[PDB]
Amino acid sequence: SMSVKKPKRDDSKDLALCSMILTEMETHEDAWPFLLPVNLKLVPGYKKVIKKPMDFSTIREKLSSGQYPNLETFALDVRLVFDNCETFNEDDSDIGRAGHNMRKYFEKKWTDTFKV
């Protein structure tokens, strides 16, 4: 509260570390469904069903232009990618399985990097 300061973690490396994590995401072989925005005019349903589209290229642009206030807002956008994927795609499908794989991949890197 006012003039009662909670000891804070060092966040000076967060931008670099998130950029590193995102690079590993972008280069994962199962990243292909997530590299670019879903094409809203070639994919029936998507615009109506998915209220907040998100993809790695959009996250990269936001990270490069100071649009994430903190690391948690970055992780929210990454998770949004996989939450959208689960909403729209069957688990069995190639895209659906890619999403599950990439979520698992991200969350381990997230824990290993920041839950130091």
mmCIF file of C-alpha atoms in Angstrom:
data_model
loop_
_atom_site.group_PDB
_atom_site.id
_atom_site.type_symbol
_atom_site.label_atom_id
_atom_site.label_comp_id
_atom_site.label_asym_id
_atom_site.label_seq_id
_atom_site.Cartn_x
_atom_site.Cartn_y
_atom_site.Cartn_z
ATOM 1 C CA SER A 1 0.000 0.000 0.000
ATOM 2 C CA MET A 2 1.002 3.671 0.126
ATOM 3 C CA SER A 3 4.670 3.876 1.188
ATOM 4 C CA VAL A 4 4.664 0.131 1.942
ATOM 5 C CA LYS A 5 6.896 -1.354 -0.710
ATOM 6 C CA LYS A 6 6.889 -5.035 -1.507
ATOM 7 C CA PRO A 7 10.319 -6.334 -2.577
ATOM 8 C CA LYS A 8 10.178 -6.635 -6.371
ATOM 9 C CA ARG A 9 11.781 -9.149 -8.726
ATOM 10 C CA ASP A 10 14.410 -7.850 -11.134
ATOM 11 C CA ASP A 11 12.523 -7.457 -14.403
ATOM 12 C CA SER A 12 15.295 -5.763 -16.382
ATOM 13 C CA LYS A 13 15.913 -8.843 -18.536
ATOM 14 C CA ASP A 14 12.244 -9.695 -19.175
ATOM 15 C CA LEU A 15 12.047 -8.194 -22.677
ATOM 16 C CA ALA A 16 15.138 -10.123 -23.831
ATOM 17 C CA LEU A 17 13.951 -13.353 -22.200
ATOM 18 C CA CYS A 18 10.457 -13.139 -23.712
ATOM 19 C CA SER A 19 12.007 -12.447 -27.109
ATOM 20 C CA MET A 20 14.197 -15.541 -26.624
ATOM 21 C CA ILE A 21 11.153 -17.665 -25.695
ATOM 22 C CA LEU A 22 9.189 -16.351 -28.649
ATOM 23 C CA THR A 23 12.068 -17.185 -31.021
ATOM 24 C CA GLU A 24 12.051 -20.773 -29.771
ATOM 25 C CA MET A 25 8.288 -20.861 -30.351
ATOM 26 C CA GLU A 26 8.632 -19.458 -33.868
ATOM 27 C CA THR A 27 11.208 -22.099 -34.804
ATOM 28 C CA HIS A 28 9.391 -25.127 -33.348
ATOM 29 C CA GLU A 29 8.386 -27.474 -36.166
ATOM 30 C CA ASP A 30 4.765 -27.443 -34.954
ATOM 31 C CA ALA A 31 4.564 -23.632 -35.029
ATOM 32 C CA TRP A 32 3.147 -23.465 -38.568
ATOM 33 C CA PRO A 33 -0.534 -23.016 -37.608
ATOM 34 C CA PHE A 34 0.419 -20.028 -35.428
ATOM 35 C CA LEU A 35 3.046 -18.068 -37.354
ATOM 36 C CA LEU A 36 0.598 -15.707 -39.099
ATOM 37 C CA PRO A 37 -2.938 -14.533 -38.380
ATOM 38 C CA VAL A 38 -5.688 -16.941 -39.353
ATOM 39 C CA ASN A 39 -7.045 -15.685 -42.694
ATOM 40 C CA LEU A 40 -10.466 -14.371 -41.710
ATOM 41 C CA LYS A 41 -11.728 -14.414 -45.288
ATOM 42 C CA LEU A 42 -10.508 -17.890 -46.202
ATOM 43 C CA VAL A 43 -11.559 -19.581 -42.953
ATOM 44 C CA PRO A 44 -15.346 -19.828 -42.386
ATOM 45 C CA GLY A 45 -16.426 -19.338 -38.774
ATOM 46 C CA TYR A 46 -13.220 -17.908 -37.429
ATOM 47 C CA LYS A 47 -14.080 -14.203 -37.197
ATOM 48 C CA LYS A 48 -17.450 -14.863 -35.548
ATOM 49 C CA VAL A 49 -16.278 -17.591 -33.154
ATOM 50 C CA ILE A 50 -12.878 -16.282 -32.059
ATOM 51 C CA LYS A 51 -13.336 -12.913 -30.363
ATOM 52 C CA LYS A 52 -9.634 -12.123 -29.970
ATOM 53 C CA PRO A 53 -7.414 -13.634 -32.689
ATOM 54 C CA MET A 54 -3.746 -13.878 -31.859
ATOM 55 C CA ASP A 55 -0.660 -15.373 -33.526
ATOM 56 C CA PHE A 56 3.126 -15.352 -33.128
ATOM 57 C CA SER A 57 3.761 -12.618 -35.707
ATOM 58 C CA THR A 58 1.349 -10.296 -33.910
ATOM 59 C CA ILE A 59 2.983 -11.081 -30.573
ATOM 60 C CA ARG A 60 6.403 -10.413 -32.138
ATOM 61 C CA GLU A 61 5.237 -7.041 -33.468
ATOM 62 C CA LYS A 62 3.773 -6.061 -30.078
ATOM 63 C CA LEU A 63 6.911 -7.178 -28.230
ATOM 64 C CA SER A 64 9.103 -5.188 -30.672
ATOM 65 C CA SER A 65 7.048 -2.000 -30.283
ATOM 66 C CA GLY A 66 6.648 -1.816 -26.504
ATOM 67 C CA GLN A 67 3.014 -2.921 -26.382
ATOM 68 C CA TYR A 68 3.488 -5.391 -23.484
ATOM 69 C CA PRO A 69 3.574 -3.521 -20.139
ATOM 70 C CA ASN A 70 4.977 -6.587 -18.371
ATOM 71 C CA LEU A 71 5.803 -10.264 -18.752
ATOM 72 C CA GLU A 72 2.320 -11.401 -17.673
ATOM 73 C CA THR A 73 0.619 -9.548 -20.507
ATOM 74 C CA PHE A 74 3.003 -11.307 -22.907
ATOM 75 C CA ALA A 75 2.149 -14.750 -21.495
ATOM 76 C CA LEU A 76 -1.557 -13.889 -21.759
ATOM 77 C CA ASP A 77 -1.206 -13.335 -25.503
ATOM 78 C CA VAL A 78 0.795 -16.532 -25.974
ATOM 79 C CA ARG A 79 -1.839 -18.542 -24.067
ATOM 80 C CA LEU A 80 -4.571 -16.838 -26.075
ATOM 81 C CA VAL A 81 -3.065 -18.383 -29.215
ATOM 82 C CA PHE A 82 -3.497 -21.881 -27.796
ATOM 83 C CA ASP A 83 -6.847 -21.147 -26.160
ATOM 84 C CA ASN A 84 -8.167 -19.972 -29.552
ATOM 85 C CA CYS A 85 -6.711 -23.094 -31.155
ATOM 86 C CA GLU A 86 -8.513 -25.356 -28.670
ATOM 87 C CA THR A 87 -11.775 -23.493 -29.225
ATOM 88 C CA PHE A 88 -11.750 -23.877 -32.976
ATOM 89 C CA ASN A 89 -9.895 -27.126 -33.670
ATOM 90 C CA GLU A 90 -10.497 -30.738 -32.682
ATOM 91 C CA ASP A 91 -7.828 -32.234 -30.389
ATOM 92 C CA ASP A 92 -7.337 -35.036 -32.925
ATOM 93 C CA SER A 93 -6.601 -32.688 -35.822
ATOM 94 C CA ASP A 94 -3.074 -31.758 -36.933
ATOM 95 C CA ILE A 95 -3.606 -28.128 -35.917
ATOM 96 C CA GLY A 96 -5.264 -29.118 -32.647
ATOM 97 C CA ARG A 97 -2.410 -31.436 -31.663
ATOM 98 C CA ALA A 98 0.144 -28.796 -32.684
ATOM 99 C CA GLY A 99 -1.569 -26.398 -30.288
ATOM 100 C CA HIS A 100 -1.422 -28.798 -27.354
ATOM 101 C CA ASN A 101 2.249 -29.504 -28.123
ATOM 102 C CA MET A 102 3.144 -25.817 -28.374
ATOM 103 C CA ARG A 103 1.311 -24.939 -25.161
ATOM 104 C CA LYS A 104 3.260 -27.599 -23.266
ATOM 105 C CA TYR A 105 6.466 -26.355 -24.871
ATOM 106 C CA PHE A 106 5.776 -22.741 -23.893
ATOM 107 C CA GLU A 107 4.750 -23.432 -20.312
ATOM 108 C CA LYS A 108 7.910 -25.413 -19.518
ATOM 109 C CA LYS A 109 10.050 -22.622 -20.961
ATOM 110 C CA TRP A 110 8.027 -20.093 -18.997
ATOM 111 C CA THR A 111 8.551 -21.960 -15.723
ATOM 112 C CA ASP A 112 12.226 -22.641 -16.396
ATOM 113 C CA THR A 113 12.903 -19.026 -17.330
ATOM 114 C CA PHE A 114 10.977 -17.026 -14.725
ATOM 115 C CA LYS A 115 10.089 -19.420 -11.924
ATOM 116 C CA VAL A 116 13.883 -19.519 -11.603
#
